[PDB]
Design a protein around this ligand. Sequence first.
Ligand code: D4T
Ligand code: MG
Ligand code: MG
Lengths: 412, 555
Amino acid sequence: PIETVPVKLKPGMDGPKVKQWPLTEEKIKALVEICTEMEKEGKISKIGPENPYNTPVFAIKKKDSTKWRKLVDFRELNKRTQDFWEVQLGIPHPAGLKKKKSVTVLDVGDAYFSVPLDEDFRKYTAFTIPSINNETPGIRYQYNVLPQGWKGSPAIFQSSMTKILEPFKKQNPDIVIYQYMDDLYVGSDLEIGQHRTKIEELRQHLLRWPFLWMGYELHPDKWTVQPIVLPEKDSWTVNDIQKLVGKLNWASQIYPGIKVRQLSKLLRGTKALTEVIPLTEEAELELAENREILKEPVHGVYYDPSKDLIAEIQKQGQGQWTYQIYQEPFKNLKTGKYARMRGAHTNDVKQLTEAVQKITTESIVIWGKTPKFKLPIQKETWETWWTEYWQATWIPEWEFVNTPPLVKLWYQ
Amino acid sequence: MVPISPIETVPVKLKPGMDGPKVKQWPLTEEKIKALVEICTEMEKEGKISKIGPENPYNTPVFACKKKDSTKWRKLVDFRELNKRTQDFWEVQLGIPHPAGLKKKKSVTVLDVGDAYFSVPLDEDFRKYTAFTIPSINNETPGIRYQYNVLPQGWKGSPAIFQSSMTKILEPFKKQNPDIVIYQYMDDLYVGSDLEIGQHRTKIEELRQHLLRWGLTTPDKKHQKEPPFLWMGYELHPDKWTVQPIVLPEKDSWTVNDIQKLVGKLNWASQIYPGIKVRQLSKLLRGTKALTEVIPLTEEAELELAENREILKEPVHGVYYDPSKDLIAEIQKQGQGQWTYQIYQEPFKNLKTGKYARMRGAHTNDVKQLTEAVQKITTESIVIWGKTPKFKLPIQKETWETWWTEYWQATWIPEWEFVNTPPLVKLWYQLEKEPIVGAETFYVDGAANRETKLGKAGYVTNKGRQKVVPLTNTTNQKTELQAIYLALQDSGLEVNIVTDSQYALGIIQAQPDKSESELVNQIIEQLIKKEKVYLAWVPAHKGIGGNEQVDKLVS
DNA sequence: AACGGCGCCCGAACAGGGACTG
DNA sequence: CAGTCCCTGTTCGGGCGCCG
Ligand SMILES: Cc1cn([C@H]2C=C[C@@H](COP(=O)(O)OP(=O)(O)OP(=O)(O)O)O2)c(=O)[nH]c1=O
Ligand SMILES: [Mg+2]
Ligand SMILES: [Mg+2]
């Protein structure tokens, strides 16, 4: 009884044609069981090979959850319908969500299954379930309702979502509610008991209309930044000052007031690397001034909503990972560091996976966007293991880099 | 008035703005003339081909070759112009089934659908786009033109439609027989069960009659009821499997196209024959772009080929997959970037073997290449068995721990254990983390002219030692590597080296043990002889230490 | 002399970043 | 500041094996 909202691709673009990658046995068995129930419920239907479009699919388990969840890699389809969920029916981002003391993320993707999808657009939601050892050809489906993981789903359901959340927002005018992809971000300044009590009222408010029982909690007021810090030693060697000048020279690309004149004067001649160099009176002055500039904020750094967010990650060793988020080079909007995540001291890929998920979550709260990541890993290494550790219902864009650390810039 | 088959049709459209095929026929021999006129007459009575007239302004030629070495002939249409204008299909064939992924089944039957493509209907609105004339005489009778009511062989959409139509027909039978395994690859059907031989043939006949309801025939010609079964190019026995006999050509004078077929068979043979190498044979296929050019076999390619033929002498076989047992993968280093592995569940009962010998990067080390071989085995194992095997690797736990914890990139290996089978993989040198007290400090640099390609390279040290070497036909990058080489040559066992070259430092910090650059290989040889080496970087053109002094010398 | 699938080893074309020259 | 170079990387299409 609902008229399907017309959905069109961006002009001049064809639908996604991305190959399905191999899945483990437990993932295929999970997807076969899930798709069988969805087909019995009419959410998906089998299709033939005359549909040239395809989108990868796999399965995940969220944090502390034993239940398999179907996840479609709609990244290609999403950027081929970008003028829909950003120009026609866009969701405004609340600037106060990041200021709230506690923010709980609720999985509401199952509500999208109640709204039919435009018949002319269902062909672009095609996916293929693989088989072990290629026993059978691929089992192809396409969606009949709004699919989870498609940016057009919360955009179309937004009108339906507003009416559902309208009584609750009137009951609590201080609560900030943000919707991104399949998730709902609920932030408040109430106490932990008061917050979780209000979260359950919202759950019951949604029930009167399979992962609604979970509530991942955030605390953006506790989020920290990792500035550039300089070492403080009692004695300095030629090697120490050579590393310091190298760090300050690169840092001058961010803070133009940094000087290295009185410090390079200490390195006059051809001295041994371990020779102790006492800092002169002017060198102490120049090093003290540089430490204050690193505390001052960077000039003219603000968020541009029309530009993409970029995230770079550095492996620092011993469970330490630093990251920077920017839109223009050396104009970082945020710098941070993670330590002692899951997989620390045993698994780099699980840590890097965890770090990407945290950075994306922070970007959704602060700006409403997911950044494109520059991952310090080989492509084949990441593509072999990352789905084993993924616990989120969205997937950011990423590319692969290889920058040897000439100077430890973000972590001494 | 042709009867509509029970198989549901597949709606096939064309690319917009384009029409159908209009290609003239190809003059062929009279042997092909008397072998296709009888086909278009038999298919017309069976409803597989209908005759058209002047209302169908299309045409397409058809060249024919014999069937797969048998009494029958094969008809294939040249739809290369129809494929350029037909809509794209998404292929549902995602890979090739491997016999090592088959589980033990008490009873096994291999079927083969007769007239696969000729038993599946074509779209009603698409039959008009398949027009072709048949001249009974090469230059007399104009010949009545026919059309296709089924799937023609040669069309780019025929395989995808048959595989999808076959699945929909097997779905109701598989739902009524869950314990029966049906490997469906094109038209050949591998049917297996743990039922008794008597009860197994009963369900086979039930399946044969089920397929017959849609016009799918399973004749007794290619019906296999007893081992060894010929399935997917293998020999399937009740408890083991092997590849069909592989014959390597033995010529006196070898050309380019012969080595390509030789390396191809050795790749196909390396899935069960352990220790096959194709490094030195494929090395002969470099540079020369003349397929009909004689290439003499090098001494390294001759010894490699002689060792491959001796492996193929003794017959080998693989076993089948048992889900109750673990998967084990063990890797050996064959030298010169060559790796061989075996995947098994019980010792010396290999499911399959394989090799990894890809050289990626100008500079690398054995640890990087071992990591790559592990990733290749993991993805291959997920395709065949859907899980990752436990690895047995010829690298100490301490060696691996040192590499991955110190590398700047994320790297990881799944659950594994050390196996002591030399040659062990190790790191051949370790750069120091702090400067070395008492070791001479070399400030190195090198510059080169973009135009004349001339350059210099040298160093200055804290003890007054100095060198400048002029170089001819070089680059800025090469002189920076040369400067580090000079400092390693002229230093003691412990040395501190200061450079401003991000390029040179990046190569050496990754601890390579092999390189496509002779200069880097010489640098590696020096780094191994040292006891301690500390590399330090400084920004160029900043008046920093001796770097400013050595910069004046070489520029 | 056809179609589709997968694998390997190959080279040409292309992208991208440091560094020097006008 | 552009426009090159040098070096190193990925993508892709074709050679071959094999299947239907
Ligand atoms: C071997 C082969 C096959 N095919 C297509 C056609 C039918 C299926 C199976 O081929 P087939 O089993 O050898 O012949 P088929 O048409 O089934 O006839 P039968 O011998 O089974 O009676 O794949 C093809 O298009 N080109 C080929 O070279
Ligand atoms: Mg057949
Ligand atoms: Mg230099």
